[PDB]
């Protein structure tokens, strides 16, 4: 993640499983880069089983 | 901070007490103002006796 953002690309598709979702959703907070310029996508069909809070993101 | 970041300004002094320092630090970490586009300062004299670990610190 640090070299891909060093490479200045913003638009990514996360081919990931349900288990890896729980850890990516916390590392995405951990590295500290959460700007609105990024676009994210999850391949799994589950989004209401994981924590979603409106105000942690600033409009990503 | 929403208007302050909308004001094209990134340099804020945070003068606060120990407890208020704790709440504001956990709060700003909670949304994620954690990129290199910020520079935060504490005038509180204890920042080594309060819960600080550098491994969270990777962007700010």
**Between chains, do B35 and A35 touch, taking CB under 8 Å as contact?**
yes
The approach used to solve this structure was cryo-EM
Interface test with A, best of B25, B27, B32 (most A CBs within 10 A): B32
Contact by Cβ (8 Å): B14, B24: yes
SS3 state at A14: strand
Instruction: Extract the tokens encoding A32.
Output: 């500290």
User: What is d(CA B3, CA A50) in angstroms, rounded to the nearest whole number?
Assistant: 30
The alpha carbon dihedral of B17, B19, B25, B28 has a sign of negative
| Residue whose entry in the numeric block shows the structure tokens 């995405």 | A28
Q: Are B39 and B13 in contact (CB under 8 A)?
A: no
The CA distance from A41 to A12, in Å, is: 7
Question: Resolution in A for the shown PDB structure?
Answer: 8.0
Cα–Cα distances in Å, from A19 out to A24, A25, A46? 9, 11, 11
| Rounded Cα gap, residues A44 and A15, in angstroms | 8
Interchain pair B60, A32: CB under 8 A: yes
Whether residue A29 lies within 8 A of chain B, CB to CB, comes out as: yes
Q: Across-strand partners of B26?
A: none
B3 at the A interface (CB within 8 A)?
A: no
Q: Which two tokens stand for residue A45?
A: 């069909």
């Amino acid at each position: 993640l640090k070299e891909m953002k060093k490479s200045k690309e913003f638009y990514v598709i996360f081919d990931c499983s349900h288990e890896t979702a729980a850890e990516i959703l916390k590392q995405i907070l951990f590295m500290g880069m959460m700007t609105e310029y990024y676009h994210y996508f999850f391949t799994t069909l589950d989004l209401f089983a994981l924590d979603l809070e409106l105000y942690r993101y600033s409009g990503v």
